[PDB]
Amino acid sequence: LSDLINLNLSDTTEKVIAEYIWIGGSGMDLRSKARTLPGPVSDPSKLPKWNYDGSSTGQAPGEDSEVIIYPQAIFRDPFRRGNNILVICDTYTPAGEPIPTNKRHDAAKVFSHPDVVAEETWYGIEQEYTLLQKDIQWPLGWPVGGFPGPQGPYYCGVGADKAFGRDIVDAHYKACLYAGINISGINGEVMPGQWEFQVGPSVGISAGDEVWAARYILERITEIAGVVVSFDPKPIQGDWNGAGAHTNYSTKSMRNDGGYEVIKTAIEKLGKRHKEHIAAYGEGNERRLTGRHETADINTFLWGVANRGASVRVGRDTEKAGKGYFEDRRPASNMDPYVVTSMIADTTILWK
Amino acid sequence: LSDLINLNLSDTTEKVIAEYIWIGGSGMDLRSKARTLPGPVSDPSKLPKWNYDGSSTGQAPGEDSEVIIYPQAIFRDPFRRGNNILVICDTYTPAGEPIPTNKRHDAAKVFSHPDVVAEETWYGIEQEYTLLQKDIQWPLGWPVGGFPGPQGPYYCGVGADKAFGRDIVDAHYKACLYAGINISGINGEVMPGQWEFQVGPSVGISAGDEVWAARYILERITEIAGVVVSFDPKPIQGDWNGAGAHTNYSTKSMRNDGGYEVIKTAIEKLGKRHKEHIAAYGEGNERRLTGRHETADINTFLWGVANRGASVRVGRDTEKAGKGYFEDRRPASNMDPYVVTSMIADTTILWK
Amino acid sequence: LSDLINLNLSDTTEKVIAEYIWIGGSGMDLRSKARTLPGPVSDPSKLPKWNYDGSSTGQAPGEDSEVIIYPQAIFRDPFRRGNNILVICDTYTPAGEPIPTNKRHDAAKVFSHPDVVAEETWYGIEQEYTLLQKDIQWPLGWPVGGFPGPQGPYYCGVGADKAFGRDIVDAHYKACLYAGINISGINGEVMPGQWEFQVGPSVGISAGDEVWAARYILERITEIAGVVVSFDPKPIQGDWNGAGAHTNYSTKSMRNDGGYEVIKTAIEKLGKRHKEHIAAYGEGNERRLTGRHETADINTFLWGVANRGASVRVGRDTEKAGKGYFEDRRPASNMDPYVVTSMIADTTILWK
Amino acid sequence: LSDLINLNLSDTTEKVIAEYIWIGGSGMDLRSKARTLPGPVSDPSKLPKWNYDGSSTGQAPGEDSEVIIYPQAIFRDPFRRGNNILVICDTYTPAGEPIPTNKRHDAAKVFSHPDVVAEETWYGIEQEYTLLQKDIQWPLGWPVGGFPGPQGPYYCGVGADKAFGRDIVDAHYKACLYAGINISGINGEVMPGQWEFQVGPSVGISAGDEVWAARYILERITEIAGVVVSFDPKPIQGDWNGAGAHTNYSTKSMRNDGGYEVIKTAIEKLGKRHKEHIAAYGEGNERRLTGRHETADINTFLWGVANRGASVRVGRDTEKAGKGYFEDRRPASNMDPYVVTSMIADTTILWK
Amino acid sequence: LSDLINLNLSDTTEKVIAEYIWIGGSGMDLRSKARTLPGPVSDPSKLPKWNYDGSSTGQAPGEDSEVIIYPQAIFRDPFRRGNNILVICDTYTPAGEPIPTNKRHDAAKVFSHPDVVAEETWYGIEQEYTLLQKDIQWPLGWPVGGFPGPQGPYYCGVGADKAFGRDIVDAHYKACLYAGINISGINGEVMPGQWEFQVGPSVGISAGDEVWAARYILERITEIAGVVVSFDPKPIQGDWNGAGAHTNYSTKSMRNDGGYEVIKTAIEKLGKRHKEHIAAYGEGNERRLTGRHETADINTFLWGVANRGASVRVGRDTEKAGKGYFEDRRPASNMDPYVVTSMIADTTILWK
């Protein structure tokens, strides 16, 4: 079936294949479908819109199930290659308003303000995932109906005993680099069969545009290998760690001289908003964040510099030179990056 | 056996391989066989006619079973590549008349009229299919003697849990783009293991040819993988949807200013012919069309703009701008594109 | 999943993938993780440092688990190709001191002296490994719950009966040559499924780098083949021989006329320090070194010219010409090249 | 192994093996082991007291892990047969006070009250369970990673595709009838692989004993079949009915003419105690009792004559004849029969 | 094969097969063969002697490999049944002196001392063993290259996933009860696949004999199941409890009223002999006895009333009533019962 999937269409025609991708009803799964266009295009403004049956996804009533999707971001296709592209789309109503599942409209509204634009907000998102076997929700390298050895050799270890699913991870890393996602590294986590990828400094809404892209690519890659991928914080319970997502924030004021006071003020503003942020960081965070294995408490807001378990973590270089980034470690691995980045920018700058 | 199937003959010889393809006795299955020609040919007029045994297919008596096949359409071969071609042929009688299974003669006669030629009728065909396991007529991704999970995630799903047979679909999409079929996109449908492909705006009789070509190509790609493909309107019964085929009609007068009145008149003329069209859209359509959750019914004719369950569906933008096209949703997935295109053209224009 | 792992990124971007590699808590296992850099880099001085969680490895307390890793050596990447690199790193403390597991600091301190720099010392390290089946601890090619034939045909055997896991060995040899490790040959040892590779003459701390590189590569290669690799001296007990590592030492004075007296003086200095060297060559080397068939013994120090069962072995051409190297055969196969090379250089030259 | 498990020791010796069974720390798991006795015995008061280690079960601290075992009931041994017996036992501290997980002490105190003794109380317990595959915890007859057909054919089914695990049910029914349990019927429930059994009319505390023996037998029989039994109320989520256990209750005053008034008064007495009863009758019952199909809800208490959603139901025959029992449908499959029976007796007979 | 193994020879002939069992060179393994005898016999002194090849076992030099076999105890054959018997034997040199591996001679001399004979010593033995898979030496019910769940559910478990290999335990229990062994209980230990059995109160040397016979039966039963028995103290390293045996000891003076003073004097006498006792009670016991969970240590001798970590424990009953036995928890599962019983008798009754 190869020699047909990997067939170069630029030798015989100029038509391109576009991949319209949107978010399903639950707010965590991705839906996509392809089309053909007369020629190459790289500006999202001049791409046609679509519609789809919202009843089949859970985002529209029965009588008028037409749901409109608008192209928003363009990346290079790492599966079809050539001149084909992936389109990260946003979903509206035929009247013209976003559906309640749509969250990029609010994010674009927040990031479009002159203040946030002048602040040059930069976000870096670290995301876990767990590779499970297909039919039984049992992670890779775990024997069927059997636990693996105790933790300790699975964190960045090399060998057939410790690295489970490294082919998928290397393929995902090269595919995300090829497509255009600003990926900044990979590593293996303490749980066996659990890995991590980081989307590096990316400005504004573009951040949320590409991390959502990476997930899509990752899932599709696993579809080739017959493996399930879970971003759920707690796929396995017991003495095994959870999966979470970390956010690195860097405004222009922080990177300049005297930015430590800016960081302190931003963290103080983030404080007293702990409950709303926790309630908007994604379902399942209750089980992941309980204090085990140096994890931040759900009901307490404390920030440190050297402690691994804290709400907000500030590095040594930032404490020394008084400038840099700061890291929030509360968001769960099944979050919505649009929401998290939006309200972080809201609390830091817009809020008074 | 590779390195021999994928062997380039253009480095050693000028001879080409042609694939004569025709429709079998049942009117739904395809038959084909290959031959060798001295050099490249691109015009269907200068291709030699061929013959076959009608008794082995079910289209001729015992005494004189020879059936003549006339080359009609030429496409590029996506399996042999090089300068080889696929020939979409038509079946006649040695005396000179079409056999009762032949339907392209009537369509060509209708489309050859000056009125239909001057009106630039364009058709678009949406075709459903289902991927079943080989020995047991049981769809892909369904456990043997076991139903899959409830519907809802399989419509455009991405993970390994949702997309079944995606490699065949991508191969078919690229192969049809390579050959020359004006394919316009693909997607996955609500039933697991069920997919869709659109043949885009194509003018006149060529439309029909293209559709059949695509089907042939799919029928071959599946047999590389070891999967059965069914266009039957209802392969699996219960709370599972059925495969279907949609048609999009657009004449020149509809495409111009004041075309909404033309669309209304055409739909009015299509009405009162409901029973004949229903009886001429494909066996098994009774089991698919049942009024399930506001969908088309066999015994009732309805048309609307947002109610997608009507017999005739007209888009919102087409109504508000007047110009555009319209869509008929009654034809079954085992139809004959010649017949439906001919009937639509005759009712809209030729009929008084 | 190929066509994505083996995807050339130099055709679309300038960014490189770097592989930071360090030594885990036990002093014998290797941990690694990757990142992306804006462009190509070849000097280790101008590479950024990292940090990692020492708690997950066993090299830091609970409260402040951050362990800093400094790039030290650069090699080409034999798995990613292109402009990607492997970085052999060294572990420190955020205060600035090496952790007790760090051994390259001492080695660099010893090799940075003017005396050792002026007197060029070259080291060659022979390393033996065993290939075992994955889930069981049973060596490759042995039957499950059964022993192979008696020894004698497995030393450099050619047929399918004697060469077990040769594909891994050939791949490792080619990959180590490609990356830049100064490899100098391979062979198969007397035990079936056991092999050996030589890292050739390389000067100073560089040796301790590239050996640790080769091991990493080897282990990663086994991940592709689903095989476990063991450098443990005695993976199998009975009448089956053990795995060891040998060190060829040659300073500048030994390479010149009258160097036999230098070799004799160096061996005299190395003697009477048997206990410390043995205790620093590994823990549990008594199992491999017993004295069977006149081999080396732990409690006794001996040196000869042809007695293979001696602590120090001197080749025939060396006393024939009075110049050359000498071979120490005490270190175990799970040694630390930093420590061994440091002790040999310190005893030979620095000590009085 | 067999012909030794089925070995008649009465031909050779007069000693008898006694099997002691107690309830573990979780309050719903059963532990048991074996003892050798000089001769046959039928009186539980003639059986010696005994002990076990509470640390290994979760019932005592490390300093005092000794937990004493008091024989309370005797049945026949169905697996060893002959003169060997099963003993149902109670758990006590070395000092003489029952441990917190002990619940038969309070029930025996309640059932020894002169009013309860003279009222001749009769219970019948309807207990449902689910059979699961050993490794993957997927119900019996369910394809791995799939679902069976919709509900409706499995209730009291007879075919090979409708009754899944009737061998285990037949073996358990015969074994409980041979041991001495009053088991009064079995059938297959609506879900595949789910069954129930009825422990018939047993007076007072004895009822709670028999059920705690019946469960034991079931478990061991599943151990012979390599299947896992589950008394969890809702093992599978979706449109699949759960497993809840009910209790029919009657008293001598209810067996007399005009007892419908007494049944009514007991019904109001059991009412307005819904909170404590639901709290003490099993956790995890919220998933089972939701309100679907007009059934019982946790937050609402309902009693009627024909409504199948009633928390407490009274049959037509009770109204007609004027006397009988009434059925409590509140508890789940994972109850403790002791607390249920004792609470019903308290809230009906003695508590004012 | 069967229906011939279970063949009754009493219907046809009067000859009886006698099975001779002895202890091999390693001091732990058992060897055995079969002999044909003219008729039934029940007295060990009426049985002929054997001789066997000590070279093939590891007990005699090549020039004199003849080792004489002395019958000592007689039990019934559980595998051949009928009138066939098992014989426990003693090993001797041709001249007449015992071989070094013989240990029953010294215990027989000790137990024939008039004071020991008059004291009528009573012993009980607690033997714990582990069942392993045949080829890979991984415990029963453990996934290959994996681990089961944490400890806690397996102690005296009943389910299919908690008790592993209970068929072997049942067969062994009934076979030992039919043979004539005083076996007084079985249960499942905390580790999966690990069990124990208690050899009950047997007077003097006879105790040890029975234990050996018991071991023999166990091994042969495992041979039927294709499983490997292991009496090694610590087969699996990690957070898994080992297999250590125990010995309860009583004397007529201890059973007499006011015997707690005698028990205390015996405990004091057994104290300060810890070095010799630990040396002679099994090697490889260092791994089992470390000090975890406040247990016994090799370098610490402790005796108490309730501390479960005591080397010699005394129950509450022997303090309340003042009469009873005491339990030595020092020896491992691979003891020789002869030497343990003999030294316990010596250091209490005759040694001053």
Residue numbers in the entry:
A (entry chain F), B (entry chain G), C (entry chain H), D (entry chain D), E (entry chain C): 4 to 355
Publication passage describing the model:
One such an example is glutamine synthetases (GSs) (EC 6.3.1.2), one of the most ancient functioning enzymes in existence and a central enzyme in nitrogen metabolism of all living organisms, catalyzing the formation of glutamine by condensation of glutamate with ammonia using ATP as an energy source. Decades of studies have established a striking notion that all three classes of GS enzymes, despite of dramatic differences in amino acid sequences and protein sizes, share quaternary geometry in dihedral symmetry assembled with two oligomeric rings. Considering that the active sites of GS are located at the clefts formed between two neighboring protomers within the same ring and distal to the ring-ring interface, each isolated GS subcomplex ring holds multiple integral catalytic sites. Cryo-EM structure determination of GS in both the catalytically active and inactive assembly states allows us to reveal an unanticipated self-assembly-induced disorder-order transition paradigm, in which the remote interactions between two subcomplex entities significantly rigidify the otherwise structurally fluctuating active sites, thereby regulating activity.
MALS analysis shows the GSII from Glycine max being largely a homogeneous decamer in solution. When supplied with ammonium chloride, the stable decamer-adopting GmGSβ2 demonstrated significant GS activities. To elucidate the detailed mechanism of how the interactions between two GSII pentameric rings remotely trigger enzymatic activity, we next employed single-particle cryo-EM imaging technique and first determined the structures of GmGSβ2 decamer, as well as that of the CsGSIb that adopts decameric configuration (thereafter named as CsGSIbDec). 3D classifications of 104,717 and 43,876 particles for GmGSβ2 and CsGSIbDec, respectively, revealed that both molecules were arranged in D5 symmetry with two pentameric rings stacked in a head-to-head manner, a strikingly conserved structural feature for type II GS species. Refinement of the GmGSβ2 and CsGSIbDec structures yielded maps with an average resolution of 2.9 Å and 3.3 Å, respectively, with literally identical dimensions of 115 Å x 115 Å x 95 Å. The active sites of GmGSβ2, CsGSIbDec are structurally highly similar to each other, as well as to that of the maize GSII, suggesting the catalysis mechanisms of these plant GSIIs are essentially identical. This highlights the weakness of the inter-ring contacts, characteristic of type II GS.
